[model samples]
Target: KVFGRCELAAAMKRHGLDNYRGYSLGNWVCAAKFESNFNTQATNRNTDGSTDYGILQINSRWWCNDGRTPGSRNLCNIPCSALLSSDITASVNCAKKIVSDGNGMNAWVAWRNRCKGTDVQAWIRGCRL
Candidate 1:
């Protein structure tokens, strides 16, 4: 469950989380493990069988592709698998940013916040093992 620097750094940069590093990524990793067990390619389909994709478990089939292309993936123009391939830490960092930026733990909060609650800074401040 330990993360090295390369993965942590790539994640921080991808999500514009330059301010948080070192101890920060570790905490995020903790939250992620609790959320999706560090599985970047993880997804969840509701009772209806729609696909929610990615390690961050982003829902592409239902969200926005942001008008990228004709057949763009949901939400961000990046596929869940492709995003996972870039860096798992980035996904972790992305979660950290969204939580800290003040949306109460981002899209995955229902999973992360209940175990973690709404205190993102607590996650960052408390991420020591």
Candidate 2:
């Protein structure tokens, strides 16, 4: 439901994610863009039957409880459906908690697979901070 990248960036900044936990905001932006194209309703089923949820593509295996996955850690202590909201409060909190656990952005496969060691600045280009 977001209009553009700038809007996303502003939301993230307001959530205290600007330079949060040592990772650049651009890293989060790029990861989200690739993971879910900034779509709040995004959900993708994994080959293993687990699903990735929301803009950050959090996995059901470890993060959120989707009911289908048995014995999920659900470390985020939230329902997977919560990640699909345009509010993004719960999703961002969960993501920040994950990062605080020392994994950093590497917790996101999209970050490790694509944004890592790349010029991700384009994700936030021309956005007035």
Candidate 3:
């Protein structure tokens, strides 16, 4: 919905989903809309290792490397220094690389599709600009 194709592509790749090169902008938009309503700041808790944080809703611990400290860049292998201060994109880029394994953009498309339902392709078609 609110999320554009580029953001979705970045987020999807970050979440370890298939690249948007294969999925259209509309499809990624549908997934982002359904999953987090395009809320990049959304966060949730889960014991099954599916809880998400921020735009892509990456697990807090994944970024936190250590334990249960939320927002702790120390746990984040990338760390929060000049990049964290200058750009959120920097962190997202790091996350993207982690998820994509240096192959694609850091996007959260897979998680979005998880909640977006089976008609992912159809949903995108019905989505409005």
Candidate 4:
């Protein structure tokens, strides 16, 4: 498991995610908190039969292979389980591409449902990254 929000933020900054593809650190951090609570091993089965993978909760519909999920685009070219690594390197890289696909942070339901249009500054507050 990650140490805490500050650690995650610092790691994200090192990965150029503090501000990348027009999304803010708060956006990413907030989404990560709500999606998987920064737990890289987090996985949830969607009602639609697809499973969300990792801290970013990337969908198997197009991001990665979940074995049972048919029609996966697997755009990241990696297994969905790859996102579950504590390292988060693969997950961050895939998330970057997901945002670059013109979807911004909207690709993540957690961002839209809980973070969008909200005061997200607190997500990174007190985190000296």
Q: What is the TM-score of each candidate against the true structure?
A: 0.48, 0.93, 0.43, 0.94
Write model 1 residue lDDT over 76-127, tens digit each, in one string: 4344455455455435444454455444434565445554444545444432
Error of 2 at 109 (Å): 1.5
lDDT of 2: 0.87
Candidate 2 lDDT by residue in tens digits, 68-104 = 9877779999999999998989889989988888778
Residue lDDT tens for model 3, 1-129:
235555555555554444434444445445456545666655566665434554444554445332455544433454323222322454455454444444332345563436333555544443333
Q: Which candidate is the best by TM-score?
A: 4
lDDT of each: 0.47, 0.87, 0.47, 0.87
Against the true structure, candidate 4 has what lDDT?
0.87
Whole-model alpha-carbon lDDT for candidate 1:
0.47
Q: After superposition, how far is residue 65 of candidate 4 from its true place, in Å?
A: 1.4
The deviation in Å at residue 102 for candidate 2 is 2.7
Ranking by TM-score: 4, 2, 1, 3
Those runs of model 4 whose alpha carbons end farther than 4 Å from true positions after fitting are none
> Candidate 2: which stretches are off by over 4 Å?
none
